[PDB]
Write an enzyme that holds these catalytic residues in place. Structure first.
Site, PDB file in Angstrom:
ATOM      1  N   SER A   1       2.490   0.116   2.040  1.00  0.00           N
ATOM      2  CA  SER A   1       2.493  -1.278   1.522  1.00  0.00           C
ATOM      3  C   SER A   1       2.125  -1.337   0.014  1.00  0.00           C
ATOM      4  O   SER A   1       1.986  -2.473  -0.514  1.00  0.00           O
ATOM      5  CB  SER A   1       1.595  -2.164   2.413  1.00  0.00           C
ATOM      6  OG  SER A   1       1.824  -1.925   3.810  1.00  0.00           O
TER       7      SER A   1
ATOM      8  N   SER B   1      -0.966  -8.467   2.326  1.00  0.00           N
ATOM      9  CA  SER B   1       0.034  -7.396   2.622  1.00  0.00           C
ATOM     10  C   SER B   1       1.157  -7.961   3.504  1.00  0.00           C
ATOM     11  O   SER B   1       1.748  -7.184   4.283  1.00  0.00           O
ATOM     12  CB  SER B   1      -0.635  -6.169   3.260  1.00  0.00           C
ATOM     13  OG  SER B   1       0.079  -4.952   3.001  1.00  0.00           O
TER      14      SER B   1
ATOM     15  N   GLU C   1      10.561  -3.279   5.454  1.00  0.00           N
ATOM     16  CA  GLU C   1       9.448  -3.287   6.449  1.00  0.00           C
ATOM     17  C   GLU C   1      10.072  -3.572   7.819  1.00  0.00           C
ATOM     18  O   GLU C   1      10.817  -4.532   7.977  1.00  0.00           O
ATOM     19  CB  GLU C   1       8.335  -4.272   6.054  1.00  0.00           C
ATOM     20  CG  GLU C   1       7.385  -3.784   4.961  1.00  0.00           C
ATOM     21  CD  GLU C   1       5.974  -3.383   5.386  1.00  0.00           C
ATOM     22  OE1 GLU C   1       5.041  -3.565   4.576  1.00  0.00           O
ATOM     23  OE2 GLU C   1       5.798  -2.859   6.511  1.00  0.00           O
TER      24      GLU C   1
ATOM     25  N   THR D   1      -3.783  -2.152  -1.234  1.00  0.00           N
ATOM     26  CA  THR D   1      -3.873  -1.184  -0.093  1.00  0.00           C
ATOM     27  C   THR D   1      -2.479  -0.800   0.416  1.00  0.00           C
ATOM     28  O   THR D   1      -1.533  -1.558   0.173  1.00  0.00           O
ATOM     29  CB  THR D   1      -4.699  -1.730   1.099  1.00  0.00           C
ATOM     30  OG1 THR D   1      -4.359  -3.069   1.498  1.00  0.00           O
ATOM     31  CG2 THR D   1      -6.189  -1.701   0.828  1.00  0.00           C
ATOM     32  N   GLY D   2      -2.397   0.322   1.139  1.00  0.00           N
ATOM     33  CA  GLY D   2      -1.277   0.694   2.032  1.00  0.00           C
ATOM     34  C   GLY D   2      -1.728   1.517   3.241  1.00  0.00           C
ATOM     35  O   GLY D   2      -2.550   2.429   3.090  1.00  0.00           O
TER      36      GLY D   2
HETATM   37  C1  LIG Z   1       3.182  -2.892  10.422  1.00  0.00           C
HETATM   38  C2  LIG Z   1       3.190  -1.792   9.354  1.00  0.00           C
HETATM   39  C3  LIG Z   1       4.596  -1.198   9.267  1.00  0.00           C
HETATM   40  C4  LIG Z   1       2.082  -0.701   9.594  1.00  0.00           C
HETATM   41  C5  LIG Z   1       2.173   0.048  10.916  1.00  0.00           C
HETATM   42  O1  LIG Z   1       3.041  -0.230  11.729  1.00  0.00           O
HETATM   43  O2  LIG Z   1       1.373   0.948  11.101  1.00  0.00           O
HETATM   44  N1  LIG Z   1       0.838  -1.458   9.477  1.00  0.00           N
HETATM   45  C6  LIG Z   1      -0.332  -0.909   8.955  1.00  0.00           C
HETATM   46  O3  LIG Z   1      -1.059  -0.069   9.402  1.00  0.00           O
HETATM   47  C7  LIG Z   1      -0.216  -1.736   7.679  1.00  0.00           C
HETATM   48  C8  LIG Z   1       0.879  -2.511   8.449  1.00  0.00           C
HETATM   49  S1  LIG Z   1       2.553  -2.402   7.776  1.00  0.00           S
HETATM   50  O4  LIG Z   1       2.638  -1.402   6.736  1.00  0.00           O
HETATM   51  O5  LIG Z   1       3.043  -3.724   7.482  1.00  0.00           O
END
Ligand SMILES: CC1(C)[C@H](C(=O)O)N2C(=O)C[C@H]2S1(=O)=O
Length: 265
Positions: free
Chosen positions: A42, A100, A140, A209-210
């Site tokens: 992210s 995010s 995404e 963050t990511g």
């Molecule tokens: C949902 C995601 C693809 C990802 C995921 O599916 O693990 N999520 C996180 O841990 C941050 C969010 S995200 O990057 O929007």
């Protein structure tokens, strides 16, 4: 010698650690696996906002976008509420940096236009800055889902620290626009436990963050010493050994940033 603690922290939390701090007049670059390729996750949503801002007049932000509940696919705390109002380009920027918001990001890609829903144009935009390394490819959520080994949807600590430098301290946006980016990153909500939690309280911190699968945890920030000297800090991590369903260890980022603080004073 600082290389011995990063590797020590690498050993403790069963991880791979990337670390770049650009150089100042008065301090040398910090390097650890710096020019090694990590997954954005992210973190792309920060330079994306400068992308809209830049190829768009300050009047653009009060343009409204409508969307179906079939656009909402990734984690989207802000989007799934406004599916009937819509969100102006500007709100979508607030959303995408502070929360995010995954859908908000995908619509801001769409607003850059061109092949593969505006990823081509968004790498496009990274090249105007000097970055000939980083490259976004998917939307995404697949960009988080990539397997370790893949050159796709990846950047380096070296590459992304330098981009940020140019967008917050540098001159790659005019001051009016530069102030929105920095204010939005300054009230991020997702960063509590990463870079912020490793630096003393009298240092000021803005961050994006990511997080991903295969244990991916990421922080890019600008930091300010009690005397007001800025720096740029990039911390990136993954844990492929643990599996696709590996847990991401946030402590590891906060430890590494405390190490960096030791050096910067
Ligand atoms: C949902 C995601 C693809 C990802 C995921 O599916 O693990 N999520 C996180 O841990 C941050 C969010 S995200 O990057 O929007």
């Amino acid at each position: 010698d600082l290389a011995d603690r990063f590797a020590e922290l690498e050993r403790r939390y069963d991880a791979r650690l990337g670390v770049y701090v650009p150089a100042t007049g008065t301090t040398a670059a910090i390097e650890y696996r710096a020019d090694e390729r990590f997954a954005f996750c992210s973190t792309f949503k920060a330079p994306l906002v400068a992308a809209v801002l830049h190829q768009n007049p300050l009047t653009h932000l009060d343009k409204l976008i409508t969307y179906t509940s079939d656009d909402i696919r990734s984690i989207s705390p802000v989007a799934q509420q406004h599916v009937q109002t819509g969100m102006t380009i500007g709100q979508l920027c607030d959303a995408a940096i502070r929360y995010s918001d995954g859908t908000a990001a995908n619509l801001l890609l769409a607003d850059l236009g061109g092949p593969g829903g505006g990823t081509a144009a968004f790498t496009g935009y990274l090249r105007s800055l000097g970055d000939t390394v980083s490259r976004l490819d998917a939307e995404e959520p697949e960009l988080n889902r990539d397997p370790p080994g893949d050159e796709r949807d990846t950047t380096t600590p070296h590459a992304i620290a330098l981009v940020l430098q140019q967008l917050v301290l540098g001159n790659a946006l005019p001051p009016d626009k530069r102030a929105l980016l920095t204010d939005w990153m300054a009230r991020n909500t997702t960063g509590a436990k990463r870079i912020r939690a490793g630096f003393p309280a009298d240092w000021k911190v803005i961050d994006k963050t990511g997080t991903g699968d295969y244990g991916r945890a990421n922080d890019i920030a600008v930091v300010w010493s009690p005397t007001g000297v800025p720096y740029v800090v990039a911390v990136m991590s993954d844990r492929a050994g643990g599996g696709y369903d590996a847990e991401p260890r946030e402590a590891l980022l906060a430890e590494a940033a405390t190490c960096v603080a030791g050096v910067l004073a």
